[PDB]
RNA sequence: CCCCCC
RNA sequence: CCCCCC
RNA sequence: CCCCCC
RNA sequence: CCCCCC
RNA sequence: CCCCCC
């Protein structure tokens, strides 16, 4: 009873899956860094308000070290919790990095910054090319009634999560759709259309995100926690998840599209001897994505599964057809410049040839509710 | 009820499997070598930092012995663990070789190297043709803040694991795709695009890898441990596994391809009296690969199963067809120059004849969702 | 298999009557038949 | 034979933890020489259980590496699935991790 | 009669 | 004979 | 009794 | 025995 | 390895 096919179906075990077992102790990172993360004191619109000025200054400033910028980026991000110190320890889930806790107290004296209980602020905050917002005049980092603090805090964070989308994908320094995001969240009053930061400030941040690995781990883990939060999530948390809805497999172009354009469309020239081999192995790969879940969209950023599994190197024939056939379908096929060693232009033009020759006529059979003839256009 | 076929199916037991039993004591290697492996002291960015300079000098230097180079290659590899001494003893799993532990202490005096507690460094480290990195100027082996040590350490290791792919397969000294790997891991900031080592340094290392057997055993065993490590693995460990994703049966060309091109495609001219005998015995061989697992991709390097089982000598007819039919499928059929005593060119051209005569027309039956006619191209 | 030159053959019970019969089958067929295979084969289209 | 040895430890008591320091009972009785097969398996199977298996460098004349790897092979192949039967309060299926 | 390992 | 962790 | 190829 | 592409 | 649109 088809012994060849039954055994062939079993051969797909080569893909899934490496074993998960308690093999700890041996393979460990070790060498733990410190990373001083400033954390505010009590829950109020003081101290942390003026601390915002010190962190944003520290980030946007030449002559800075790694941990000093890393800790500031973590501190400036986590600034909407009653107890950030407790939040970080619970959410970090990272063996390589141990986060220290530095409590910030009320600014009683302030020689040239803060004291954060021993005024150890000789060259941490107390370090014009920096720079600043678009307006060369803003000052005092908004010291006013508690209303408004939520907007001015969310303004900075909103821009940070956008850079995550365009960091590990490509540098894209020449031309990026950053302004396209800023004009959004303005037509609708989600954040006050003001406090725009210059590209220079965004540049030094975007560079460090792509550089450090652990910095991205903290950001990704932050999303998984706030997304699964049931009930009415905080106002800020809604804005965070809103930006995170764009990261959906930001990198797996030869996986999420090859199914939509290649498999979901079902053209007559699909099930051939050429594509028979690639079609079968593609299904086993698709199972890998779903069987894990949770962190499945976040693969290209940290996970190593995108090296050989999700790559189009395993199925260059089917990928070339699915990409070629889906050119006339969606207009958005200009930015992706294409060009790989296994581009396979022979079958690429074949896909484009199908959509132009058909021009309707056929209607995917559809033996239920379609009708007969009468399809001029 | 087909007594011939039922008994014939039982005849495949000749392949699988030699017995696994406690037959130790008699067949043993004995004659244990020493191999002095330098191991750093406490967990810090000192001693081991300058030790890196002494090992890389020792490796890239004429007038050196086997164990001196072997131990250095082991030491330079295992340099990202809190307790390498404990790691090695647990992970070695090798009876023939017993690894000694040499603790390295703080460089307090340093006459011409290190003392590693008795300054026994007369001609171990204290031995211009060597050589060095591309830049004829680099020095001081980077003595700076702890940040950066992870990159400069990972730079050397990243190149070592690449050479493993091209060591037991073939020498390939005339032209190898080493530069193709170095341009990768650069477009994306995984390692700093710098500290490139000359081919001469890579030559003496690649030669020793192919020469010694036990040296490869330690490297292979290292991968199986770090791959099965659950949770968020170290940053370096991700880079190690990334390179290990290319070793996937680096040698079994007549096994992983003959299924993809021959069996997975299913052409009309497949199930013949000629290929009937080779098709049956191939399935029993395929089971051997999966039934063991774990170290199944790593067969050609150490395991002796690749002598007669996975070789195409058992099935030269089916192999010649599967290879011949899969020429027009994938463009990458130029590097493999072919040419064996049992090449069988009669059936080789037959496979190529099928793909050129068909040119579509047939569509693998596919009695589900295909349609009828309309396949000009 | 091409490797049938070294083995020189030649026994008292060689039986050349049925020996040529086996060789006659592989040369007369030249494809055409495909071991039935009632699962995944198809119909016709076997010129070579 | 291991059970009879275990009784020796309890039947005396009082100075039972203090054996290796003065008492001569640790020469042949408590040594693994009497049971090198079971000891090699118990030590090998309990490597992935507790992380603290680095300091003890191992290495004896009767190490028996054949059965040592067998113990380590069991814990890595299982990866859950089985649940020690436990015919009281366990349930059925649903053990992905 | 006895040939090890502990 | 003994090499850990608590 | 045995003559190959791997 | 092994020669590619990922 | 990655290049879009949302």
Q: Provide the CA C6 to C1' G2 distance, Å, integer.
A: 13
Q: Is nucleic acid strand F under 7 Å from D52's C-beta?
A: yes
Q: Which residue is nearest to nucleotide E6 (CA to C1')?
A: D33
DSSP for B82-143, written as a single string: S-HHHHHHHH---SSB--EEEEE---SS-SSS--------SSSS----S--BSSTT--TT--
Annotated binding site of C: 8
CA A306 to C1' F6 (Å) is 42
Taking the C1' atom of G1, which residue's CA lies nearest? C11
Is there a contact between B86 and D55 if contact means CB atoms under 8 Å apart? yes
Chains B and C touch (3+ CB pairs under 8 A): yes
Tell me if B238 and A302 make a contact (CB, 8 A cut-off). Answer: yes
Closest nucleotide to residue B312 (Cα to C1')? G6
Name every chain B residue with its beta carbon within 8 A of the beta carbon of C2.
342, 344
Q: Report chain C residues whose CB lies below 8 A from the CB of B354.
A: 48
- As given in the structure block, the two tokens for residue A190 are 């989600």
Note the resolution in Å, 1 decimal: 4.3
DSSP-assigned letter for residue B196: P
Tell me how long chain A is.
377
C1' (E5) to CA (D34) span, angstroms: 9
Q: Of A7, A10, A5, A16, nearest to A285 (Cα)? A: A16
Chain mean position to CA A247: 4
- Whether residues A20 and D54 touch (CB distance < 8 A) is answered with no
DSSP, res B39: E
Closest Cα partner for A56 from A131, A158, A113, A129? Answer: A131
Task: Write out chain A residues lying below 8 Å of B43, CB-based.
Answer: 30-31
Give the chain C residue whose CA is nearest to the CA of B342: C2
Is B233 close to A354, i.e. CB distance below 8 A? no
Residue B84's CB: how many other CB atoms inside 10 A? 22
Please report, in range form, the residues annotated as the binding site of D for RNA: 57
B314 touches strand G (CB under 7 A): yes
**B357/A173 Cα distance (integer angstroms):** 49
Å from the B282 CA to the G4 C1': 22
Is strand G in 7 Å reach of the CB of C13? no
Say whether A273 and B358 touch across the interface (CB within 8 A). yes
| Side-chain half-sphere exposure of B118, counting CA atoms within 13 A | 6
Distance CA A52, CA A56 (A): 6
Estimate to the nearest angstrom the gap between the alpha carbon of A331 and the chain centroid.
Answer: 24
Distance CA B193, CA D10 (A): 65
Give the separation between CA B148 and CA B12, rounded to whole angstroms.
57
Residue pair B8/B74 in contact (Cβ under 8 Å)? The answer is no
DSSP-assigned states of every residue in C1-48 = ----SS-----TT--HHHHHHHHHHHHHHSSS-----SSS--SS----
Are B371 and A268 in contact (CB < 8 Å)?
Answer: yes
Long-range CB contacts for residues A97-102, cutoff 8 Å, separation at least 24: A97/A32, A97/A33, A97/A35, A97/A214, A98/A32, A98/A33, A98/A34, A99/A35, A99/A37, A99/A74, A100/A34, A100/A35, A100/A36, A100/A37, A101/A37, A101/A39, A102/A36, A102/A37, A102/A38, A102/A39
Please state, in angstroms and rounded to a whole number, the distance separating the CA atoms of residues A102 and A121. 12
């Amino acid at each position: 009873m088809a012994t060849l096919l039954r055994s062939l179906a079993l051969f797909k075990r080569n893909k899934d899956k490496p074993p998960i077992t308690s093999g700890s102790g041996g393979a460990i990172r070790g060498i733990k860094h410190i990373i001083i993360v400033p954390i505010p004191g009590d829950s109020s619109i003081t101290t942390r308000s003026r601390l915002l000025d010190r962190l944003v200054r520290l980030i946007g400033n030449p002559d800075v070290s790694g941990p000093k910028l890393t800790g500031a980026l973590i501190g400036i991000l986590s600034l909407f919790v009653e107890s950030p110190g407790q939040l970080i320890q619970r959410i970090t889930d990272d063996p390589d990095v141990s986060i220290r806790l530095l409590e910030v107290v009320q600014s009683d004296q302030s020689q040239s910054g803060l004291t954060f209980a021993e005024d150890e602020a000789d060259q941490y905050f107390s370090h014009s090319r920096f720079g600043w917002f678009e307006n060369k005049e803003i000052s005092d980092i908004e010291v006013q009634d508690p209303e408004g603090f939520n907007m001015i805090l969310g303004t900075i964070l909103a821009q940070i999560w956008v850079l995550v989308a365009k960091a590990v994908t490509a540098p894209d320094t020449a031309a990026d759709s950053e302004l396209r995001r800023w004009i959004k969240y303005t037509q609708q009053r989600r954040v006050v259309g003001e406090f725009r930061l210059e590209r220079k400030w965004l540049d030094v941040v975007r560079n460090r995100i792509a550089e450090d690995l652990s910095l991205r781990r903290f950001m990704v883990a932050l999303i998984l926690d706030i997304k699964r939060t049931p009930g009415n999530k905080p106002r800020i948390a809604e804005m965070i998840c809103n930006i995170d809805t764009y990261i959906v497999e930001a990198g797996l172009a030869s996986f999420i599209l090859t199914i939509k354009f290649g498999i979901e469309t079902m053209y007559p020239a699909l099930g051939l001897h050429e594509f028979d081999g690639e079609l079968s192995t593609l299904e086993s790969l698709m199972n890998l994505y779903q069987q894990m879940g949770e962190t499945a969209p976040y693969m290209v950023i940290l996970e190593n599964s995108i090296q050989n599994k999700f790559s189009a190197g395993s199925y260059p024939l089917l990928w070339s057809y699915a990409m070629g056939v889906g050119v006339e379908l969606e207009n958005s096929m200009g930015g992706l410049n294409f060009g790989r060693s296994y581009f396979d232009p022979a079958y690429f033009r074949l896909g484009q040839e199908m959509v132009r020759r058909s021009a309707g006529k056929v209607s995917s059979t559809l033996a239920s509710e379609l009708g007969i003839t009468a399809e001029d256009a």
